């Protein structure tokens, strides 16, 4: 790979009144095919038999990229992710040079990607106060699984793996990776994340079109049902115990889920 | 005057993001010739 | 027997493409799609019929894990989403 010269600025931003206090602080770095650092290369070469394994390598380090949040050789951002906007979709490109063998993990690892940055961009805009101590709470146990789960289980198994582990295979990985359940407990969380997200929709969609035993009793009593941008306290314990009652035939997910309700 | 400003400013971020999509489709056609050099070179 | 067989595919890349057959994964000598191969005709009967069946297991295993994903996306009592 030829090294592209090309210039490497970062600096803080000094504007931080529209990033919550737990989002971003300094610049992005320039994408692959926008300020080349490295010369890439061509993945039919390597396609061919002898040097598939470095193929496989090649991938799966750019995968391990993905993984922690970074893009890839071969495996670069997509046209709708924006490095200046918290709210853009994330997306990731793959070169079709490469083969679908490949190609197909690379989807999935992507996708498992996609949703750790998705659920990261989430928890960093919950930290803030609009959202409320609930949901900033919810935030806070999100970003404690992420630490001390899924990027610590990578870094425990998938980096030793292809440092120090001759003979590894990228299926073996996701075989790890299964075992581990950390894409399940991800994937679930995904779900969650998007129904919320869904709600939210509906709450804002709603603009126009939004007893007598209050008289009977002696007390000065009302309803201010004012509802919000986002659900707050008990809107949020209502749609996890619905999420729980959804739940159906994994104890151990419900167990964690109840865990984290109950912290939260 | 200022919800204008901001407007205006949304309409010249609209225009160079046609200029950046310009500019990827420059960029797809440079790696396309890029590939090219190495074709014909190897 | 090797003026006989010098077109045959050696032993290592049949095994090293066999994995990927196997792991759900296409390969070069074998377009794996949903439902054909595509098998080479330079590959000996028997060695073309022991290929045939761990590429009827790698269809097995391809078919198991669609319906996996399907009955994952759908929702069905915990009885039948422990079994599956």
């Given at each position: 790979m030829e090294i592209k010269e090309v210039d490497d600025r970062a600096e803080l931003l000094r504007?931080?009144?529209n990033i919550p206090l737990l989002g971003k602080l300094v610049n992005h770095q320039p994408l692959w095919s926008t300020n080349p650092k490295l010369?890439?290369?061509?993945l039919e070469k390597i396609s061919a038999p002898d040097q598939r394994r470095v193929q496989e390598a090649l991938v799966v380090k750019d995968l391990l990229n993905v993984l922690i949040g970074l893009e890839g050789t071969y495996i670069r951002y997509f046209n709708d992710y924006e490095p200046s906007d918290p709210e853009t979709p994330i997306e990731f490109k793959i070169a079709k040079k490469m083969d679908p063998s490949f190609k197909t993990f690379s989807r999935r690892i992507v996708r498992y990607g996609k949703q750790y940055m998705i659920l990261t961009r989430a928890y960093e805009k919950?930290?803030?106060?609009?959202?409320?101590?609930v949901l900033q709470r919810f935030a806070y146990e999100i970003r404690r699984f992420l630490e001390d789960v899924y990027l610590k289980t990578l870094v425990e198994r998938l980096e030793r793996d292809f440092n120090k582990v001759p003979n590894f295979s990228i299926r073996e990985l996701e075989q790890i990776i299964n075992e581990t359940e950390v894409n399940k407990q991800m994937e679930l969380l995904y779900n969650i994340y998007e129904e919320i997200f869904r709600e939210i929709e509906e709450r804002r969609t709603n603009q126009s079109s939004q007893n007598e035993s209050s008289l009977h009793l002696r007390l000065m009593v009302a309803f201010d049902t004012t509802v919000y941008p986002v659900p707050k306290g008990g809107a949020i314990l209502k749609i996890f115990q619905q999420?729980?009652?959804?739940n159906l035939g994994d104890r151990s997910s419900v167990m964690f889920l109840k865990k984290l309700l109950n912290n939260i | 005057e200022i919800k204008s400003l901001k407007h205006e400013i949304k309409e010249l971020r609209k225009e160079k993001n046609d200029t950046l999509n310009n500019y990827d489709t420059l960029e797809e056609e440079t790696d396309d010739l890029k590939n090219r050099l190495q074709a014909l070179e190897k | 027997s090797n003026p006989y067989y010098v077109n045959t595919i050696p032993e290592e890349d049949i095994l090293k493409y066999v994995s990927y057959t196997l792991l759900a994964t296409t390969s070069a000598l074998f377009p794996f799609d949903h439902e054909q191969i595509q098998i080479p005709s330079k590959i000996p009967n028997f060695e073309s019929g022991l290929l045939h069946l761990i590429?009827?297991?790698?269809?097995?295993?391809q078919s198991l894990g669609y319906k996996v994903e399907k009955f994952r996306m759908l929702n069905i009592s915990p009885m039948k989403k422990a079994l599956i």
């Open positions: 504007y931080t009144n010369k890439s290369f061509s919950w930290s803030d106060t609009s959202f409320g101590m999420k729980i009652l959804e | - | 590429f009827e297991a790698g269809l097995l295993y």
